[PDB]
């Protein structure tokens, strides 16, 4: 098992560190995996790429989730964590993780 | 294009967009082509070349057809579509009848000659003749073959399929050969789509008058899609089944002028003995 770099900030003021760059390319490589991989319990269905398919449809380009989801056991706590202390610093990497991830799946949405 | 795709019958038929769920399933293909609603909802003369041949080429690909034709250019002036000339000239010689037959004749005549020459008024004339009536039958079209589905007109009575109505959409377009032949297509596939094991018989259609020609219906029919041409001739026998149940005694009341024979006039009185007399026929055939 490597070195979780995320779980040693918990005590810090998190606005101090996560300009760190080895720290926004963790977090920013974390919640990809988040927006590919989570499972709503008791369900089969990636909830979040039902959602981008769904959103491309409409061609809308907002992207709604949940801090439970975030929060819970299959989300990623650290992040659920780190996002109220820090969120103008927080959003930013978030949203350049949801643009890669769109722009994977619809080659067309640069239009 | 979002127009021109919502009334033809290939992507009404993949949506089934006479139902409820039509607009998410084209919106959903629109995003699996990779296409922009704003691309599709602006005029197609708006967009830059590149794009258009780009999305001309999406939907080429998706519609798979090996459809080719005639492209005539004069100058500086709008490039012409053969297909879309002969639809103008078709809708301004059929329609409507309440006009004289050379005075639909001279009409025709004038829309041919317009479609070689820049001149001002007669791209003019050719454009508005595009943008009211060519729209207006297909719009007119596709509505029928909804209500039709969505209100189950039709009906199996024996050996075919048959389709009434409460009230005709618009009676100026029911006794041009264009709009029947197309509508009678449109609605026989749309009708079999939905449910297995409709392929195997032919459909009867059958569309009332009023006015100066109150107390009457037009009647033609379309054979069965699982038909097999043994080359590509496409020969048809339901006009020769209505011309002879017309032989049958006592008579009916039958109108038999047309060149075409599977289109005829009936009297509304003799429609249930028309209904006997048919099947009849068709399972004397069958025996």
Known sequence: IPVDILEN???????????????????????????????????????????????????????????????????????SYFLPEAPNEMLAIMDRAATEVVMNMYPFYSR | ???????????????????????????????????????????????????????????????????????????????????????????????????????????????????????????????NTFTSICQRTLQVSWKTVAAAINQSEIIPNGPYY???????????????????????GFMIRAFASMKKGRTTKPLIAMFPLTGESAG????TGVMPIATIYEDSLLKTCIGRAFERVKKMTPPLRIVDDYFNSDIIRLKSEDRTRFIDFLQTVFEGTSN
């Open chain 2, 216 to 219: 009457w219906l037009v009647v």
């Open chain 2, 1 to 127: 294009l979002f127009s021109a795709m919502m009334v033809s019958e290939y992507f009404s038929i993949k949506t089934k967009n006479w139902t409820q769920k039509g607009d998410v399933n084209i919106r959903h293909l629109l995003a699996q082509l990779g296409i922009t609603l704003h691309e599709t909802k602006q005029k197609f003369e708006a967009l830059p070349t590149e794009q258009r041949n780009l999305v001309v080429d999406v939907l080429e690909k998706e519609m798979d057809s090996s459809f080719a034709t005639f492209f005539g250019t004069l100058g500086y002036c709008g490039k012409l579509s053969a297909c879309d000339v002969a639809r103008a000239v078709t809708l301004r010689l059929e329609m409507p009848k309440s006009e004289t037959i050379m005075n639909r004749f001279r009409s025709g005549q004038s829309i041919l000659r317009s479609s070689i020459t820049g001149e001002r008024q007669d791209r003019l004339n050719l454009n």
């Open chain 2, 162 to 184: 048959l389709f009434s109505c409460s009230r005709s959409i618009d009676e100026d377009m029911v006794d041009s050969r264009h709009f029947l032949y197309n509508t009678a």
């Open chain 1, 9 to 79: 900030i918990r005590g810090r003021t998190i606005r101090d560190h996560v300009s760190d760059e080895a720290v926004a390319k963790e977090i920013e490589r974390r919640f990809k995996n988040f927006l590919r991989s989570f499972h709503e319990p008791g369900n089969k269905q990636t909830k979040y790429i039902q959602m981008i398919k769904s959103m491309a449809a409409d061609n809308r380009e907002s992207l709604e989730v949940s801090f439970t989801d975030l929060s819970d056991d299959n989300g990623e706590q650290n992040i």
